Amino acid sequence: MSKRKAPQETLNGGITDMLVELANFEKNVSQAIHKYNAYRKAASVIAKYPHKIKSGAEAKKLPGVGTKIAEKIDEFLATGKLRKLEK
Questions:
Q1: Burial (CB count within 10 angstroms: exposed 0-12, middle 13-18, buried 19+), residue 23
Q2: CA torsion sign, 82 to 61 to 69 to 45?
Q3: Can you point out the beta strands (E) in the chain?
Q4: What is the C-alpha to C-alpha distance for residues 69 and 39, in angstroms, rounded to an integer?
Q5: Which of 50, 43, 38 is nearest to 14 (CA)?
Q6: CATH number at residue 75
Q7: Which residues belong to the annotated binding site?
Q8: So where does Na(+) 1 get bound?
Q9: Which range of residues forms the domain containing residue 12?
Q10: Which of 87, 86, 80, 78 lies closest to 18 in space, CA to CA?
Q11: Within 13 Å, how many C-alpha atoms sit on residue 61's CB side?
């Protein structure tokens, strides 16, 4: 796109894609602004991070990420797959 080229080594391009996607679902919805900044801020630092998050702690140390969104990051680096186990 002239100056804005895609990323050669997609590091955190899969995570931000799930935080930026649902993030729109937060603001796009009425009573969903608290969770909005959750992925909107976490996806911002990760989508614009110069390195990869090793464990969930590496995501919490980032400025803007809390323990809720950062907790989901640990599950990403932990196993990677997210079954539908709600218990």
A1: buried
A2: negative
A3: none
A4: 7
A5: 43
A6: 1.10.150.110
A7: 60, 62, 65
A8: 60, 62, 65
A9: 1-87
A10: 80
A11: 9
- Tokens 């990323």, located at residue: 7
> Position 5: which residue type?
K
Of 49, 45, 54, nearest in space to 20 by CA: 45
Instruction: Bin 80: left if φ > 0, else alpha if -120 < ψ < 50, else beta.
Output: left
As given in the structure block, the two tokens for residue 67 are 């323990």
Q: Are 49 and 14 in contact (CB under 8 A)?
A: no
Considering its fold, how many domains does the chain have in total? 1
CA gap 51, 11 in Å, rounded? 7
Q: What determination technique applies here? A: NMR
Binding residues for K(+): 60, 62, 65
Measure the CA–CA gap between 35 and 54, rounded to whole angstroms: 24
Residue 46 tokens, joined: 């990760």
Q: Which residues are catalytic?
A: 72
